[PDB]
Amino acid sequence: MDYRQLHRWDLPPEEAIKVQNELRKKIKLTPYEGEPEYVAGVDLSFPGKEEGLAVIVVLEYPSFKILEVVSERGEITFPYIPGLLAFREGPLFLKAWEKLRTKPDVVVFNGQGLAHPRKLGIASHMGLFIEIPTIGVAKSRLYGTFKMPEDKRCSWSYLYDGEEIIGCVIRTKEGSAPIFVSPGHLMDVESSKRLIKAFTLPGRRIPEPTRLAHIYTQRLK
Ligand SMILES: [Ca+2]
Ligand SMILES: [Ca+2]
Ligand code: NA
C-alpha cells in the first residue's frame, strides 16, 4: 500500500522530539462517519533481541473475517523511549505496509494516538504517513488525567490534558483493567471510542484488529 515518507528516521532523540512538534501541527481530528468495511490492526514482536517482526492483519467488518496478513522482519535501531515509540517501530511497520494489498478504512495501533505529551503518538504519526484514519489502543496510560471508569462493561471516562479531551478510558471487560483509546489522524475522540467499542467483542478486553495482530506476531515467530 502506498504512503508518504515525511522525514528520515535515523535521528537522535532531541531531533526526533523536534520532528514531532512540527508533525503535530499536521494532525486532523475529524469525525469518522459511517461504518468501515476493512479494519487493520498492527502489532510487533521481537523474536531476537533488537530483531523485530511487524504484522498487519486486515479484517472485514462486521464479520471480523481475516482478509490479509502481511509481515516483515528487520533490525531495530532506535531504543524504546516513552513518547518516541514511532521512531522505534515506525520503519518496520512501514515496510509491512508497503506489502499490503488491501486498503483499510481504519488502522488500529498498539499504543496511543492523541493521548501523548506532544499530541503525536505512534497512531497519529503513522496516520500522517499512510493518510488513512487511525486509532491508538493501549493497555496503560502515557499522558493525560482521568477518573477511573466503573467496573461495569462499557463504562468509560474521558482522558484530559487540562480542559482538553485527548482520548478515553474504556472498561471493555468487567473485572479486567481498562484500555486507553485515542484518535490518531483523520479521527476524533468520539469516533475512536465508538469504533473501538464496535471492534471489541463481549467478553474480550482487546479489540479484534490488534487482538488478532498479536496472535499472528506470536505464531509467525
Ligand atoms: Ca510496560
Ligand atoms: Ca503484542
Ligand atoms: Na505492538
Swiss-Prot record:
It comes from the Bacteria. Residues 139-141, 214-221 are annotated as: Interaction with target DNA. The record marks 80 as: Interaction with target DNA. Changing residue 125 to A: No effect on cleavage of DNA containing inosine. Its EC number is 3.1.21.7. Gene3D superfamilies: archaeoglobus fulgidus dsm 4304 superfamily. It catalyses: Endonucleolytic cleavage at apurinic or apyrimidinic sites to products with a 5'-phosphate. The keyword Transcription regulation does not apply. This is Endonuclease V. The keyword Cytoplasm applies. One of its GO terms (biological process) is DNA repair. It is an enzyme of class 3 (hydrolase). The lineage of its organism: Bacteria, Thermotogati, Thermotogota, Thermotogae, Thermotogales. It comes from Thermotoga maritima (strain ATCC 43589 / DSM 3109 / JCM 10099 / NBRC 100826 / MSB8). Its cofactor is Mg(2+). Transmembrane segments: none annotated. The gene is nfi. Changing residue 89 to A: Strongly reduced cleavage of DNA containing inosine.
